[PDB]
Ligand binder design. Structure first.
Ligand SMILES: O=C(O)c1ccc(-c2nn(C(=O)c3c(Cl)cccc3C(F)(F)F)c3ccc(Cl)cc23)c(COc2ccccc2)c1
Ligand SMILES: O=C(O)c1ccc(-c2nn(C(=O)c3c(Cl)cccc3C(F)(F)F)c3ccc(Cl)cc23)c(COc2ccccc2)c1
Lengths: 261, 258
């Protein structure tokens, strides 16, 4: 069944490429300088970037709020991308429909954090399919709670990126996260855990072949699912604090509805 | 890195686990499943049977303090076991402290599952058995403090690990190079890579029909991390309400800036 695992890995890589706008391979070429992106490093360069490259989400007038809400809009776009990618995982659409919804609901936060790391280095993050680059210092320095909201994302990403995964690795990893049989409220866990066992086999084999000198990388990548669960939990608690504290974050009620999750 | 060397490391760790922990999963299962007249526990299911149990072997505080005493004992045993893990005592001393500070609680929960089934937990080296329902029914926050341990244990026990498995698994948890404040992560990760290699081979040989148990067991390190956090948060709440309990200095230090 070795060749079947390679097939599953090839299938997932191909679908991963079509589903997501900016791959890790392309992002690394931009970050390293190998078409130069617009750099956002302060207030004035932000004002020119939306006026020049036209970042879609520009509708509050405060800077830190607008950036945070920009992160919200992009995450909503990513949810739809992850949802399309999930449909291509062998077995997923044959699951009970409520269970498909449940796996996506509880998994998107972990996948967004994972995939965001592909767009970051220690100095900033790519935005708008790589045309912009927002510096870590500028984000880290936003006022009151917003500065401390951005920086944990970078600290996770730098640690995660030290594993040096490529897109073919990440496609199987993302699928493994989706097929988590321990999400609350699953109706039929058995076929989810069955698919995950296939995906885990595919990830293990892929990592031995693609990183043969990287001892126990499979184990180390699974240990990063501990980090993911913990930071997703910390993330939710920070959103709750931001909602309860800030009143200058009223949006149109229909816009609030799009962002409900 | 060679197969026979991994088997040697598994046997070393299993042997040391036996010397360090007096109540094994093997012994606990023999008591729990029964059919033995000689190993049969006294069952504590209410207030009066608790009163009879002390003659044989406030309530919620007394039980909570009993868990504190046992946890201190567990730390001592876990610490003795850690010293036997090849390479651990050769590490920088501050890192040795750090690995223990962050590892002991995750290990206590792991080994506590060995003493539980869905209906209760063995106590006092297997001589007693306290029902889950009784613990769940303790007053104010103490009732809910006991129960999350049970929820993990039922899931964890479904993996059907035995002691030779748990010996390597416990060592892997201790040698975690991602603990906060470690000074030299590289020598810790090198040891874990051997321990991880040892666990993988051990699970393959001992559970050949249990597909991807290695991966599923590592995913359980996630459930451990979450319940330690929920535990620490519950203690902080109990402290602000109760002064009628101090904590043992060993436990006091483990929680400092955890
Ligand atoms: O392109 C992508 O793949 C992409 C994916 C994730 C993020 C992003 N999400 N995010 C979260 O807080 C967040 C997370 Cl991690 C998980 C779930 C929900 C949230 C939510 F809802 F609360 F936002 C961030 C926090 C800090 C930073 Cl530096 C980045 C993000 C981004 C940024 O996009 C921007 C676009 C324009 C201007 C500024 C940022 C891109
Ligand atoms: O034998 C063992 O290895 C063994 C190991 C852990 C526990 C135990 N600790 N514990 C904690 O709350 C606790 C924890 Cl997990 C970690 C650090 C500090 C605490 C603290 F501070 F609060 F005490 C529990 C809560 C609920 C239950 Cl069901 C069990 C325990 C037990 C119980 O032992 C008993 C002995 C006599 C009477 C009743 C119970 C045994």
């Amino acid at each position: 069944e070795s060749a079947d695992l390679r097939a599953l890995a090839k299938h997932l890589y191909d679908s991963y490429i079509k589903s997501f706008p900016l791959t890790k391979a392309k992002a690394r070429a931009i970050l390293t300088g190998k078409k130069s992106p617009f750099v956002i490093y302060d207030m004035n360069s932000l004002m020119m970037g939306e006026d020049k490259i036209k970042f879609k989400h520009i509708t509050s007038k405060e800077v830190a709020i607008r950036i945070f809400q920009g992160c919200q809009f992009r995450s909503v776009e990513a949810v739809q991308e992850i949802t399309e990618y999930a449909k291509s995982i062998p077995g997923f659409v044959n699951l009970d429909l409520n269970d498909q919804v449940t796996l996506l609901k509880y998994g998107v936060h972990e996948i967004i954090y994972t995939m965001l790391a592909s767009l970051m280095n220690k100095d900033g993050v790519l935005i708008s399919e790589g045309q912009g680059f927002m510096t870590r210092e500028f984000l880290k320095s936003l006022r009151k709670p917003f500065g401390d909201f951005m920086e944990p994302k970078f600290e996770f990403a730098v640690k995660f990126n030290a594993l040096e995964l490529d897109d073919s690795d990440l496609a199987i990893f993302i699928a493994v996260i989706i097929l988590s049989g321990d999400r609350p409220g699953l109706l039929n866990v058995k076929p989810i855990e069955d698919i995950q066992d296939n995906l885990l086999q595919a990830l293990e084999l892929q990592l031995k072949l693609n990183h043969p000198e990287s001892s126990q990388l499979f184990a180390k990548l699974l240990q990063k699912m501990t980090d993911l669960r913990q930071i997703v939990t910390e993330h939710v608690q920070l959103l709750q604090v931001i909602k309860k504290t800030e009143t200058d974050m009223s949006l149109h009620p229909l816009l609030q509805e799009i962002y409900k999750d």
